[PDB]
Design a protein around this ligand. Structure first.
Ligand SMILES: CCCCCCCCCCCCCCCCCC(=O)OC[C@H](COP(=O)([O-])OCC(O)COP(=O)([O-])OC[C@@H](COC(=O)CCCCCCCCCCCCCCCCC)OC(=O)CCCCCCCCCCCCCCCCC)OC(=O)CCCCCCCCCCCCCCCCC
Ligand SMILES: CCCCCCCCCCCCCCCCC[C@@H](O)O[C@H](CO[C@H](O)CCCCCCCCCCCCCCC)COP(=O)(O)OCC[N+](C)(C)C
Lengths: 69, 57
């Protein structure tokens, strides 16, 4: 029965080790992402949460019919 | 010896030679804030896919 239907314990053991590593990495990545989102939303210095401002390319820098703009 | 300017001459944009130095900051601007750093590097696939609750891709 053991020869025909199953494997040794080392296979399940090391598959479990691989599964555990994947899951623990995913967990720490999730926590880190939550912290990064908190900081990027509070500070606005990150690539995320960039709210539009006015394009400076719309300003007209030509003499404006009076000297003081 | 005064000649009256012809039609269209007093409205020309002309050049002026001056000793007055070109003002550097006539708007009295402050220093501009520093930009955000930039995007850089090669794009690698996200580690362990999307990572949504139980999805492995
Ligand atoms: C023709 C057949 C064919 O071409 O199949 C080739 C294809 C080749 O498979 P493979 O990538 O070599 O095998 C990798 C393993 O299956 C290992 O699979 P994996 O780890 O690549 O899994 C991919 C992943 C992503 O896969 C999916 O999201 C869709 C899979 C179906 C979800 C189950 C509901 C529908 C049934 O699966 C999941 O995330 C599981 C979540 C699914 C449940 C979603 C929540 C609601 C459940 C319903 C209640 O096999 C299949 O398509 C089997 C049917 C699907
Ligand atoms: C000697 C006499 C006295 C003792 C009798 C012993 C009793 C044993 C017989 C009972 C059958 C066991 C039930 C089957 C469960 C096993 C299912 C599965 O685990 O088996 C797969 C293997 O497949 C097997 O073939 C199971 C198929 C059994 C299907 C039973 C169907 C019987 C129906 C009877 C119909 C008869 C004719 C009907 C006439 C109308 C394993 O997949 P595999 O990917 O390998 O895993 C890797 C393991 N390796 C490395 C060893 C290869």
């Amino acid at each position: 029965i053991a020869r025909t239907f199953y494997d040794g314990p080392e296979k399940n053991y090391e598959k479990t080790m691989a599964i555990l590593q994947i899951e623990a990495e995913k967990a720490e990545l999730r926590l880190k992402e939550l912290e990064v989102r908190r900081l990027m939303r509070a500070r606005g210095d990150g690539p995320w949460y960039q709210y539009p401002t006015i394009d400076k390319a719309l300003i007209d820098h030509s003499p404006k019919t009076t000297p003081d703009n | 010896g005064w000649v009256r300017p012809d039609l269209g001459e007093l409205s020309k944009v002309t050049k002026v030679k001056t000793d007055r130095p070109l003002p550097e900051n006539p708007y009295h601007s402050r220093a501009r804030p520093e930009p955000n750093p930039e995007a850089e590097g090669d794009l690698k696939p996200a580690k362990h896919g999307s990572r949504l609750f139980f999805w492995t891709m």
